[PDB]
Amino acid sequence: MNQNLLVTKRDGSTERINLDKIHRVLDWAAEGLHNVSISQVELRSHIQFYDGIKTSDIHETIIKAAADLISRDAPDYQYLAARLAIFHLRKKAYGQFEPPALYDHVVKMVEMGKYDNHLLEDYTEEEFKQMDTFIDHDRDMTFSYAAVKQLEGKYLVQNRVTGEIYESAQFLYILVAACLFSNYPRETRLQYVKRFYDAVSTFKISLPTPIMSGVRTPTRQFSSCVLIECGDSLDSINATSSAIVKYVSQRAGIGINAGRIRALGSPIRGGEAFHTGCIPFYKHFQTAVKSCSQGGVRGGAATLFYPMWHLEVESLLVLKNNRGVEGNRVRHMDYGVQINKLMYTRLLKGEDITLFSPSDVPGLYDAFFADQEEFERLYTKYEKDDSIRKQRVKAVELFSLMMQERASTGRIYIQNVDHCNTHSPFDPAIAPVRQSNLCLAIALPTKPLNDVNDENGEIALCTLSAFNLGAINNLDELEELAILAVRALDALLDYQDYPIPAAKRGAMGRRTLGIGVINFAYYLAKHGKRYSDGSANNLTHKTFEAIQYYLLKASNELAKEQGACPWFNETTYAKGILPIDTYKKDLDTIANEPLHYDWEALRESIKTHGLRNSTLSALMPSETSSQISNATNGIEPPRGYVSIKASKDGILRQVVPDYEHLHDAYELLWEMPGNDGYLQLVGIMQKFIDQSISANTNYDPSRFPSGKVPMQQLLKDLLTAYKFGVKTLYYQNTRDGA
């Protein structure tokens, strides 16, 4: 009759219940939301309250309670949950809800070794006083539950043993800003810091995990993925392997080109025993790839590339096929099959495809990427030469075999090597593109290493970022954003550290960036377009011309200010060539949208002053950054309106943006009747993109007689892709609801 319920606090222990405090907090968090029952939430969490429960559990319980009500019909639960979590996380890091003054926080963190000490060296207390005025901690209320789960799980500075969280999202953004523009002239430094801070805190620009979690801390490792090219020599094999080990140790995704390794049977090159062929080395690269992962299999991802005509291609194509002898299988690495025009033509004309070890056909491999004419010449020549070891395969058999394995595993990727060189930012004669990265989006020059510290080797890297098409109002807001994205990444290039000499060489040499989009699907839904009917062709054309034009303008503006990248002379940009001049001709037949920008002015401006960065755009997928912004992933249509994630804290649900008004506007992934629509859109985007796009093919068995996808359909989509200039093809997804 004084039946209380004693709450226990952070070693301050005992104290009576405060169910009216709780309601106030809840009531607050609900402010502005529609369709959320505070009573419902209280009911569901009060029932699990027990006498001496700690306050921290009261928060967890009320948070989950709110999170478990997330649905398509009551989507504001994601914010009610998020805000509760945000509130909890403030108290958790600061003791109050109100964040400490920025200077105080930075000071405290520097003494604790959690932030880089250079922050205080580079900025004055007065400069921190001023940044604090830019900060808006109320923006923490705009995150969705899954986004807070992500920030909390892998972005905010915390102690992973104790569990202690040390910062709040707004300090993250403001300090990312400050670190990246720390070297700017006092005159403009803080105007940039603010502009960027705004951009990222209001989700206009997304930033990769390594950057968001690291910049502001003592680390200098920000690599997402590297591209290494192996020469046909034990020295190079070794070096490649060494490089892979250093890089997976830093969590980077690996793209390996092992296409020049001579085939099994070929002669010992005085000491180098390649009698045994490619597989044994591939296996060796896989162990290297997995050297810093959990059991010897969990974590550490890579994609290995080889030409379709390599002599061991049929053995190579079935490396992930589980039914087979252990010795002839490298199942934990994806493969990238490299194809060009002539291969396809052999398929079309029902003719044969000749396999050759690269060691035996002088000039063929280089020609394959750089000059199709020459490739054809050397190819036909070597087919007739009976001295040359070769094998014949019916092109149909080879293609089907590849598509089959692609179909079953989903991880046998295609790379159109002519497309990558005839429509690229680089001169193929000097710096050709002969491979991609792990998720087939990056396309950059690489040179084999002869030792791990070889200074004449070149490794390409992933320097990324993205525009949120959902958070811009008009495409003319991209000019400001391009500036900020390009400037911040270019600074990162000089800020971060390089574990391997050949990877510094490429970054400093070409200053290559890969900026892409996220929220494409939601963007199309707001404009009432769809993916499969071709209704989004002109809008896509309009949107990617704007993205590429402003990225080049920002990079051009930057070369003016601080000088073009050292190797700008190796780009097609340097010779007055633009993406609008080399795109695949057939696109003209599926989109009439006219360029709205002065490309001719820019052409001269580039020829004259050059480009800071040699490449600027690349469309990567991005589950994590998209989640932070409550955005659909990269350019992909969503699988359904509500996506589900597992956690230790319960089931995390996230509802597609503005489901309330756009449920009928969205075209879910399995609603598309086939792939033509989408591939057309990818081809259009590819007109303007410097690198490549992680494009998927998707098939639903329900749509086919006897539930089996015809090899015909698979080849037809493959050729459709090539016909509209698609550079790469990533995953293949199969099913009808996930």
């Binding site: 070369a559 003016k560 000088g563 073009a564 700008f568």
Partner: peptide, 4 residues
């Protein structure tokens, strides 16, 4: 500018 363009390097030199």
């Amino acid at each position: 500018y363009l390097v030199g």
